[PDB]
């Protein structure tokens, strides 16, 4: 009886990304998983870090520094409700899935802001406990990414360069940094070129992988 | 009589980042440059792409697709005022400076959202004209980044890996993609460990580089 969290970053319910979230949620429930969601757009999630992330009086309001202030707020329990609610989803989660379209070679701003506001010090990382020693080391995370471009465009010979180098600041810099055992990215290329029956098989293949996602071998980080 | 645009992504006017923007603006004006700013936080810039980026009736409102809809809106002149105002700053700019603290190994969400909402198709790139053939090929861009970590942490032997690999999706994936001649990043490491007199020299060295920034040799992209 494991618990999964699906973070979705797409504005449209009619999108293929939304379809992929639905497929993920259905396959996991069918396998006994408990499924919680963070549809950032449906939540109208605020992705901008500010002093309003901390309730009540600050330590140094004249010279506000987000890192020091936010960590203190997490420890003492003075973070804003929307952040706290998200941190609670993560605390309960065994597996976290990030479903998003690749945007300017990375995560959409609303997901980037989610990381910035939710992954507070002490909670998601400490200067003393990161990577293998990270707080999330008992959890697994996976990116499911849809692109406009082709797999070959995102290779060494392609115009964009290798995808693994592109995803490094997310997979390593964010996920592994916080301790996550990162699983292999689900990459869906050339969305606009994919006919209807192929898109269906894409959804079916994704649900198929999720049937045994937990048994997978994580990525290796030196 | 050249024109410069400074995009700043920091909430605090008391921040060292704000100080660096002020230093940049002052050194360029002293050298005859015209200086325009985009203080994203002071502007309360909206960093979330949505159908509200397009005014009036859409082509396909039942199945909204941002890329197709936004490009059409740029061509026909139906983009939201805040986006248009930003695109006009870029059109007039010879040099664009991005001043921001490194956040989770990249740009803050509000700057990421700025790229996503402002860099619309046809305006900032086309599938047929990118990189060297990009629309911004007559312009130069530079990142000025402040970090909590050290230069050595961001090396091959460091725990975080090489900085140039970290900055690749920004420098290449965004700036060069749109045609910019990208200049060498101004990297200010270990902010929290830097004493007052050293911070002053940091500001002075930055203004010094800007005295002859336009004559610099751009980065090489294969
Ligand atoms: C700001 C921005 C930056 C971008 N940057 C990049 C980049 O750097 N690199 C890159 O490669 N691409 C980039 N893109 C392109 C982007 O990655 C693709 O547009 C995106 O991945 C497509 O995903 P989608 O969910 O919007 O597909 P949609 O266009 O919403 O859907 C595609 C098809 O799937 C169908 N569909 C929906 N639901 C179902 C279902 N249940 N079953 C079967 N079919 C269904 C739809 O009807 C549609 O025909 C960018 C786009 C934007 C807006
Ligand atoms: C969400 C988030 C994610 C982050 N991710 C990363 C990461 O991945 N890697 C990493 O290395 N770091 C990271 N950091 C740390 C961050 O990069 C640093 O906190 C930031 O670069 C410091 O910049 P600042 O402008 O806030 O400095 P501040 O702390 O605001 O200023 C530092 C000093 O400069 C002084 N100062 C201000 N104005 C002047 C002036 N005119 N003259 C002289 N001195 C002045 C101030 O008084 C202060 O003492 C992250 C921080 C956050 C909040
Ligand atoms: O769909 C494509 O068509 C192409 C045809 C010829 C050469 C290259 C490309 C591409 O890069 C991709 C995706 C293309 C991309 O990779 O970068 C982007 C940045 C912002 C917004 C949208 C996108 C894309 O859809
Ligand atoms: O200041 C630091 O102290 C350290 C001491 C020992 C080992 C590593 C580090 C660091 O990574 C940096 C910066 C540190 C970092 O690199 O990643 C972050 C992610 C989110 C928020 C803030 C930060 C940081 O300030």
Residue numbers in the entry:
A (entry chain A), B (entry chain A): 3 to 224
Give the original sentences from the paper that presented this experimental model.
NAD(P)H:quinone oxidoreductase 1 (NQO1; EC 1.6.99.2) is a dimeric (61.7 kDa) human cytosolic FAD-dependent enzyme catalyzing the two-electron reduction of intracellular quinones to hydroquinones. NQO1 is an essential component of the antioxidant defense system, preventing the formation of potentially harmful semiquinone radicals. A frequent single-nucleotide polymorphism (SNP) in the NQO1 gene (on human chromosome 16q22.1), whereby C609 is changed to T, results in the replacement of Pro187 by serine in the protein. Overall, our structural and biochemical experiments reveal that the proline to serine replacement disrupts the interaction of the core with the C-terminus, resulting in a disordered tertiary structure that ultimately leads to greatly diminished enzymatic activity.
In a different batch of crystallization trials, crystals were obtained for NQO1 P187S in the absence of Cibacron blue; these diffracted to 2.2 Å (for data collection and refinement statistics). With these crystals, electron density was not obtained for the last 50 C-terminal amino acids. Apart from the missing C-terminus, this crystal structure showed no difference from NQO1 in the overall topology of the structure or the active site. ESI-MS analysis of a protein crystal taken from the same crystallization drop confirmed that the protein was truncated, indicating that the C-terminus was lost because of proteolytic cleavage. Closer inspection of the missing C-terminal amino acids revealed that the cleavage of NQO1 P187S had occurred at amino acid 224. Cibacron blue and dicoumarol are both competitive inhibitors of NADH, indicating that occupation of the NADH-binding pocket stabilizes the C-terminus and thus prevents proteolysis during crystallization. NQO1 P187S was rapidly cleaved by trypsin, whereas NQO1 was less susceptible to tryptic cleavage. Thus the P187S amino acid exchange affects the kinetics of FAD reduction to a similar extent as the complete removal of the C-terminus in NQO1 Δ50. This finding supports our conclusion that the C-terminus is not properly associated with the core domain in NQO1 P187S.
